[PDB]
Amino acid sequence: MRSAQVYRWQIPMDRRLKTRDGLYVCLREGEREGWGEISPLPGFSQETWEEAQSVLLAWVNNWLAGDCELPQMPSVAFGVSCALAELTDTLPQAANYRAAPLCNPGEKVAKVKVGLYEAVRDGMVVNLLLEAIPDLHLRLDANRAWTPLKGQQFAKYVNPDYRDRIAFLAEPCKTRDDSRAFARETGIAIAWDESLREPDFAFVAEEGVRAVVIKPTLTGSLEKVREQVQAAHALGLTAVISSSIESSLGLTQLARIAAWLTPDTIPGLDTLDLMQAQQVRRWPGSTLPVVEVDALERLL
Numbered sequence: 001m002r003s004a005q006v007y008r009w010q011i012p013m014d015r016r017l018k019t020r021d022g023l024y025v026c027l028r029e030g031e032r033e034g035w036g037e038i039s040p041l042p043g044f045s046q047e048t049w050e051e052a053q054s055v056l057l058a059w060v061n062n063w064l065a066g067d068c069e070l071p072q073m074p075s076v077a078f079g080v081s082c083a084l085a086e087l088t089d090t091l092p093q094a095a096n097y098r099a100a101p102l103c104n105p106g107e108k109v110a111k112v113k114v115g116l117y118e119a120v121r122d123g124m125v126v127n128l129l130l131e132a133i134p135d136l137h138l139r140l141d142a143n144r145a146w147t148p149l150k151g152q153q154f155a156k157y158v159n160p161d162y163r164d165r166i167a168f169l170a171e172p173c174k175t176r177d178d179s180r181a182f183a184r185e186t187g188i189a190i191a192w193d194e195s196l197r198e199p200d201f202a203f204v205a206e207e208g209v210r211a212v213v214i215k216p217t218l219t220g221s222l223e224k225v226r227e228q229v230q231a232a233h234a235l236g237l238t239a240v241i242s243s244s245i246e247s248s249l250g251l252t253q254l255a256r257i258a259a260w261l262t263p264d265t266i267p268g269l270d271t272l273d274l275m276q277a278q279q280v281r282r283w284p285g286s287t288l289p290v291v292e293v294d295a296l297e298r299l300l
Helices: 049-064 074-087 119-132 148-155 176-186 222-235 248-261
Strands: 002-012 019-029 032-038 109-113 137-141 166-170 190-192 209-214 238-241
Touching: 002 049, 019 049, 019 074, 032 049, 032 074, 032 248, 049 074, 074 222, 074 248, 109 119, 119 137, 119 148, 148 176, 166 209, 176 190, 209 222, 222 238, 222 248, 238 248
Parallel strands: 109 137, 137 166, 166 190, 190 209, 209 238
Antiparallel strands: 002 019, 019 032
């Protein structure tokens, strides 16, 4: 016997993004229970919050009637599939809560957002960090920020002898041909990110490419995310499971999907401190308050 609940919320963030708005699905079959988060990201997700809601509510009504197509809309396919996996006890409880800290115990790994302004500033900060911590490895996020020139102007400031400790620079340039060229000229390893979510992306052996970054809320189902992880691992690449700024609930399932699918790869989930509260599920060690389901706006 099936039942379902949908919640709508907005969490305050630490004039771009002052709230994060989203949704939870709770599927219930017999005594079992599954949750999932549907939170499309403004500027990044194609579909909107309110479109997400419509499709989520409609899909749920289908689910109650026993039919089992999932929507191909990324945010909804994702959350709906997390709920479905929790129903069947398949998503293990084990999770990777180890952080590659942003900003700007084991393998030391950090994350730097680059390409925001001057290429110079980024390479300088990058060099500084790698110089100070001899065993630090860095993950860099460009989001296609650079012309070939700026791709060169950034690397200008990074000691070639530390460059092997940049695990990846994601999407340095505006075209993939230029990012590949930057990899070759600079000997700096690259990752694809936004390329993966554009139509007709192929997993292909490319010299210089060592990682892919997989954002599940912008990709779709957990089944599709898995697929992309397996494709990468066949090519020898690192699959990083990453945050699309999900609430604590989605972040903990991303943590769980990481341990399950990319067990030795720290996920890119250090986005909780951007927000002012957790909801439903705790992230271990966060002292941010926790909103109970009790207090969530219920649409279904």
